[PDB]
Write an enzyme that holds these catalytic residues in place. Structure first.
Site, PDB file in Angstrom:
ATOM      1  N   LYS A  72       0.459  42.975   7.694  1.00  0.00           N
ATOM      2  CA  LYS A  72      -0.574  41.977   6.958  1.00  0.00           C
ATOM      3  C   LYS A  72      -0.985  42.515   5.660  1.00  0.00           C
ATOM      4  O   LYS A  72      -1.806  43.660   5.386  1.00  0.00           O
ATOM      5  CB  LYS A  72      -1.890  41.818   7.827  1.00  0.00           C
ATOM      6  CG  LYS A  72      -2.683  40.766   7.160  1.00  0.00           C
ATOM      7  CD  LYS A  72      -4.063  40.572   7.894  1.00  0.00           C
ATOM      8  CE  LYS A  72      -4.899  39.736   7.026  1.00  0.00           C
ATOM      9  NZ  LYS A  72      -6.132  39.724   7.767  1.00  0.00           N
TER      10      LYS A  72
HETATM   11  N1  LIG Z   1      -0.057  32.977   6.904  1.00  0.00           N
HETATM   12  C1  LIG Z   1       0.123  34.252   6.511  1.00  0.00           C
HETATM   13  N2  LIG Z   1      -0.773  35.228   5.996  1.00  0.00           N
HETATM   14  C2  LIG Z   1      -0.400  36.259   5.694  1.00  0.00           C
HETATM   15  C3  LIG Z   1       0.720  36.711   6.281  1.00  0.00           C
HETATM   16  N3  LIG Z   1       0.928  38.187   5.682  1.00  0.00           N
HETATM   17  C4  LIG Z   1      -0.343  38.255   5.320  1.00  0.00           C
HETATM   18  N4  LIG Z   1      -1.154  37.258   5.344  1.00  0.00           N
HETATM   19  C5  LIG Z   1      -2.710  37.269   4.716  1.00  0.00           C
HETATM   20  O1  LIG Z   1      -3.564  37.306   5.681  1.00  0.00           O
HETATM   21  C6  LIG Z   1      -4.795  36.602   4.913  1.00  0.00           C
HETATM   22  C7  LIG Z   1      -5.637  35.930   6.005  1.00  0.00           C
HETATM   23  O2  LIG Z   1      -6.052  36.861   6.741  1.00  0.00           O
HETATM   24  P1  LIG Z   1      -7.503  37.208   7.040  1.00  0.00           P
HETATM   25  O3  LIG Z   1      -8.187  37.387   8.152  1.00  0.00           O
HETATM   26  O4  LIG Z   1      -8.113  37.959   5.811  1.00  0.00           O
HETATM   27  O5  LIG Z   1      -8.243  35.610   6.511  1.00  0.00           O
HETATM   28  P2  LIG Z   1      -9.488  34.926   6.387  1.00  0.00           P
HETATM   29  O6  LIG Z   1      -9.755  34.993   7.814  1.00  0.00           O
HETATM   30  O7  LIG Z   1      -9.264  33.381   5.987  1.00  0.00           O
HETATM   31  O8  LIG Z   1     -10.670  35.939   5.636  1.00  0.00           O
HETATM   32  P3  LIG Z   1     -11.430  35.482   4.414  1.00  0.00           P
HETATM   33  O9  LIG Z   1     -12.076  36.533   3.939  1.00  0.00           O
HETATM   34  O10 LIG Z   1     -12.130  34.167   4.644  1.00  0.00           O
HETATM   35  O11 LIG Z   1     -10.122  34.921   3.403  1.00  0.00           O
HETATM   36  C8  LIG Z   1      -9.146  35.882   2.891  1.00  0.00           C
HETATM   37  C9  LIG Z   1      -7.925  35.540   1.999  1.00  0.00           C
HETATM   38  O12 LIG Z   1      -8.129  34.692   0.939  1.00  0.00           O
HETATM   39  C10 LIG Z   1      -7.409  34.557   0.042  1.00  0.00           C
HETATM   40  N5  LIG Z   1      -7.802  34.504  -1.463  1.00  0.00           N
HETATM   41  C11 LIG Z   1      -7.512  33.576  -2.272  1.00  0.00           C
HETATM   42  N6  LIG Z   1      -7.899  33.546  -3.554  1.00  0.00           N
HETATM   43  C12 LIG Z   1      -8.664  34.859  -3.705  1.00  0.00           C
HETATM   44  C13 LIG Z   1      -9.007  35.493  -4.784  1.00  0.00           C
HETATM   45  O13 LIG Z   1      -9.266  35.173  -5.674  1.00  0.00           O
HETATM   46  N7  LIG Z   1      -9.424  36.716  -4.150  1.00  0.00           N
HETATM   47  C14 LIG Z   1      -9.364  37.273  -2.953  1.00  0.00           C
HETATM   48  N8  LIG Z   1      -9.609  38.532  -2.742  1.00  0.00           N
HETATM   49  N9  LIG Z   1      -8.977  36.556  -2.076  1.00  0.00           N
HETATM   50  C15 LIG Z   1      -8.535  35.337  -2.397  1.00  0.00           C
HETATM   51  C16 LIG Z   1      -6.364  35.941   0.163  1.00  0.00           C
HETATM   52  O14 LIG Z   1      -5.147  35.610   0.693  1.00  0.00           O
HETATM   53  C17 LIG Z   1      -7.257  36.476   1.211  1.00  0.00           C
HETATM   54  O15 LIG Z   1      -6.596  37.404   2.034  1.00  0.00           O
HETATM   55  C18 LIG Z   1      -4.153  35.534   4.219  1.00  0.00           C
HETATM   56  O16 LIG Z   1      -5.087  35.325   3.175  1.00  0.00           O
HETATM   57  C19 LIG Z   1      -3.230  36.341   3.634  1.00  0.00           C
HETATM   58  O17 LIG Z   1      -3.453  36.775   2.306  1.00  0.00           O
HETATM   59  C20 LIG Z   1       1.652  35.845   6.519  1.00  0.00           C
HETATM   60  O18 LIG Z   1       2.864  36.253   6.838  1.00  0.00           O
HETATM   61  N10 LIG Z   1       1.369  34.635   6.586  1.00  0.00           N
END
Ligand SMILES: Nc1nc2c(ncn2[C@@H]2O[C@H](COP(=O)(O)OP(=O)(O)OP(=O)(O)OC[C@H]3O[C@@H](n4cnc5c(=O)[nH]c(N)nc54)[C@H](O)[C@@H]3O)[C@@H](O)[C@H]2O)c(=O)[nH]1
Ligand SMILES: [Zn+2]
Length: 317
Positions: A72
């Site tokens: 990830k």
């Molecule tokens: N669908 C998919 N996602 C994959 C994959 N590999 C890695 N990811 C990665 O996993 C993250 C989500 O997990 P996580 O558990 O972290 O997600 P949430 O539960 O949604 O966490 P939350 O903290 O609410 O949001 C995190 C995500 O927002 C995104 N984001 C968008 N804009 C920004 C920004 O400006 N800054 C940051 N730091 N994040 C941002 C990033 O992708 C970041 O990972 C995805 O965002 C992607 O980056 C894949 O193969 N498929």
């Protein structure tokens, strides 16, 4: 006309300078991506799947059917979208908020601009100290709507479209591809991880079907496994004294569910961690107005309980 403001993104200590499309241009580029990825979802969202946290129950389903697994990457998700707009051959990456940046590259073969949507991650290459875009998967290649194929179909579909393409120092982001391993290859996976971690920031494994067509949205069959100190909730401060609550839809209220320590602003949204029987304050979230709902709190607890490990995953199979 394509109307761009400047912007910078900053990741793991480095800055990228890009062109945010604003205005009617943002809207069309988004709208176009609706129509190409054929997404009749009332409200705007990248044509991409959203992982869900693995829980014990899942293993059964993992043991039966065919899944790949990957790093990830800790980066920013973005849908890469190649299109022509009004005559401009354009490469756009799209944030989850439908925010749009020009991420241009010299060598993009003309056909890609026919209509290519690949799904991948922006992140920082530890080694070069340079930026990269890791390609996970792909939804349309050059007009060829590939959503419904199988993963690999999609992946090669992608691979050969960019086959002749070469990276030049000046280019904004090194393109790379996610090496997706099959679940039943534990030793491979471990090493793959320990290879990938050396180059990119990671947050555990992602576990994706080998065979299902692309899923737009919460993909209950896309797993995440995420080293479990990084499980958080946004509560609401229900009391000066730090009683925190969560929202419960059938009751429609916010319900008290924990007490932080000390003195806090009522009605604030606070991001909190859990440890040692307790939630702890991390940071405020002026930017919210909404705590998480009951379910989420439940699930995250469930998740913080199980402390499922990468090995627990890569040992079953
Ligand atoms: N669908 C998919 N996602 C994959 C994959 N590999 C890695 N990811 C990665 O996993 C993250 C989500 O997990 P996580 O558990 O972290 O997600 P949430 O539960 O949604 O966490 P939350 O903290 O609410 O949001 C995190 C995500 O927002 C995104 N984001 C968008 N804009 C920004 C920004 O400006 N800054 C940051 N730091 N994040 C941002 C990033 O992708 C970041 O990972 C995805 O965002 C992607 O980056 C894949 O193969 N498929
Ligand atoms: Zn095999």
């Amino acid at each position: 006309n394509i109307t761009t403001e400047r912007a910078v993104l900053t990741l793991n200590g480095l800055q990228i300078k890009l062109h945010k499309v604003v205005g009617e241009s943002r809207d069309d580029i988004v709208a176009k991506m609706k129509d190409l990825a054929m997404d009749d979802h009332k409200f705007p969202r990248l044509p991409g799947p959203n992982p869900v946290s693995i829980e014990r129950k899942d293993f059964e389903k993992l043991k039966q059917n065919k899944y790949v697994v990957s790093e990830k990457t800790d980066g920013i998700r973005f849908m890469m979208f190649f299109t022509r707009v009004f005559g401009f051959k354009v490469c756009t990456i799209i944030d989850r908020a439908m925010t749009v940046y020009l991420l241009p590259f010299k060598n993009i073969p003309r056909v890609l601009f026919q209509g290519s949507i690949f799904d991948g991650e922006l992140c920082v290459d530890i080694v070069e100290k340079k930026f990269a875009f890791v390609l996970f998967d792909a939804v349309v290649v050059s007009g060829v709507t590939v959503s419904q194929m199988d993963l690999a179909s999609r992946f090669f579909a992608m691979k050969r479209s960019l086959k002749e393409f070469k990276n030049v120092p000046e280019d904004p982001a090194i393109l790379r591809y996610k090496e997706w391993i099959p679940l039943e290859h534990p030793t491979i996976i471990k090493d793959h991880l320990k290879k990938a971690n050396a180059i990119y920031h990671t947050d555990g494994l992602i576990i994706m079907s080998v065979d299902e067509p692309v899923i737009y949205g919460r993909n209950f069959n896309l797993f995440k496994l995420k080293p479990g100190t990084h499980h958080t909730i946004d509560f609401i401060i229900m009391s000066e004294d730090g009683t925190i609550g969560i929202f419960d839809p059938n009751l429609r209220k916010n319900v008290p569910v924990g007490k932080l320590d000390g003195y806090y602003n009522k009605g604030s949204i606070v991001e909190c961690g859990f440890a040692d029987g307790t939630w702890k304050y991390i940071q405020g979230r002026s930017d919210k107005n909404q705590a998480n709902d009951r379910l989420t709190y439940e699930k995250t607890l469930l998740n913080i309980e199980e402390n499922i490990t990468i090995d627990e995953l890569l040992d079953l199979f």
